[model samples]
Target chain A: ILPLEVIDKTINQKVLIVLQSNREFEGTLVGFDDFVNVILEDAVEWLIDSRNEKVMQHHGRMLLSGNNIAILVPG
Target chain B: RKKFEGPREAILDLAKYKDSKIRVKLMGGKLVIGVLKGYDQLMNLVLDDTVEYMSARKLGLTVIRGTILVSLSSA
Candidate 1:
């Protein structure tokens, strides 16, 4: 697992993350509430372009920082 | 507004509002005000430091989640 310092600066910054579930999302950076929880926002729905079906809207807290996050692209 | 009865909706890279703050309607209950920072494998999000609705007289920064989002919608 990577240290929070590596990505701590991302707080309140925009970032693109690749998940282990092969899913990608983009939003803001919310604090972990001292519990080490990761929260996201303004998340877009991953559409099944193949079937043109809207899947879901990721909005909530997840145990980020490890497990799932593949890449972090800040813009 | 598209329907989302589940988690994070389709992942979209908004080139239009790449660098700006946006107000989002989560699940159709709580008013989520935040900016679309950026996205990667983790889908980073940055929620506003202000609380919604409660901004009538005193605008305070609040952490959404357990109190905001009601439930995912599919309409």
Candidate 2:
């Protein structure tokens, strides 16, 4: 397995969309579970974050399961 | 060695399957074949078959833990 430090370097950070309720969701992956499930650092309600940073540090907290996602473009 | 009984047990029961054939049952009604990787205080694992459902239809890695799983076996 890759070290956390190394994995952190390859995050390719960006806003992760997690549909919790009626077309909404939250969180940043501070860590991951044994199941590779994500542990969000901060939770949010919106799916889109129009932040533009090349090396931002964001990961996924929710499982996509079998959903079709959208393209998160720069603002 | 610990025999992978339920979802949680599989976390560290690779010895029973390593170098041997094995079966894995998933929650989403999926069955798979893989080489038991290894186990530790952290979790049990398999060589992780590059195949997912006989086709590349579903993408991504799977890290199953103590839930959403039923059983595993050596053959």
Candidate 3:
């Protein structure tokens, strides 16, 4: 499938996204745009430090900017 | 009134960089320098003679997915 097509199939499913800043977010896929900007439900953010230690936070529903997204892993 | 050109035109402006060395910033904070070969409206890029900033690793003929792109400049 094309890149966006794959993302489209992941809607309503759990997804893991890693940002350029070494942060990770896991949540249920809600919606997205051609730019890959995405909205998620029941999202958890994971911030990773240089030593690999992680700090996490939960955001009930959120829109993530696509600018800093490095990888999107669908589950 | 002047008509506004959208992101597509902005991307097309990079045609001047074709066959020239350019620096690319990715969403993950990684830096890459390469010769521009081709690009699409989404900014997915085809680069030649690519090198990573930190390690100076050489990656020839690379295809960069647009969603992970941050910025582009003359190298």
Candidate 4:
């Protein structure tokens, strides 16, 4: 399957995404585009520190910048 | 000289590296080395005989979403 197709299958599902800045996001997939910019509802941000400690913050709904996205894991 | 096109033309140049070993750097600082098999306008790639750089883990065949890709270079 094409990459976008794989992402399309994850729509309306929960997904965990990692970013270039070492931050993570967990949310329900809402929408995306060819650029891979993502929208999510009930999103939470996870900031990982150098020691690998994680700090979470609730964001509710948000749009993620595609340029910084690294990995997306659907759950 | 060939007329300058746009991003599509840039991505299409990947054909020159087809069936050859290439190194892909992901946004999350992960590096993967593989043989290029296929790609699309978005740069989503189908790679074969892939291996993770740090872990040296064999991933076999893989479909890498373009959004997470940072850079690509011939190996």
Using TM-score as the measure, the top candidate is 4
Q: Which sequence of candidate numbers ranks them by TM-score, best first?
A: 4, 3, 2, 1
Off by over 4 Å in 2: A1-30, A33-75, B1-14, B40-44, B54-62
Off by over 4 Å in 4: A49-51, B1-23, B33-39, B46-75
Candidate 3 chain B least-lDDT 10 residues? B54-63
* lDDT over C-alpha atoms for residue B48 of model 1: 32
Displacement of the residue B53 alpha carbon in candidate 3, Å: 13
Clash count list over all predictions: 38, 1, 2, 0
What fraction of native interface contacts is shared by candidate 4?
A: 0.21
User: For each candidate, what is the lDDT?
Assistant: 0.41, 0.37, 0.71, 0.73
Q: State how far residue A34 of model 1 sits from its true place (Å).
A: 8.9
Per-residue CA lDDT of model 2 for A3-70, tens digit only, reads 23222432444334322222223344454433344444444545222342232233434443322221
Two-chain DockQ for model 1: 0.02
In CAPRI terms, model 3 is classed as incorrect
Interface Cα RMSD in Å, per prediction: 11.9, 9.7, 6.3, 3.8
Could you tell which candidate, 1 or 2, scores higher by lDDT?
A: 1
Candidate 3, residues B15-75, lDDT tens digits: the string is 6678888888885567788877777677767677777664145655555567677788897
**lDDT (10s digit) by residue, model 1, range A1-75:** 122433566677765543433345667666434333456665544422123444556666444553334234443
DockQ metric for all predictions = 0.02, 0.04, 0.14, 0.26
Candidate 4 per-residue C-alpha lDDT over A1-75 given as tens digits, one digit per residue, 9 for 90 to 100: 455676788899887766666577888989788778889888877866534554655557788877777655665
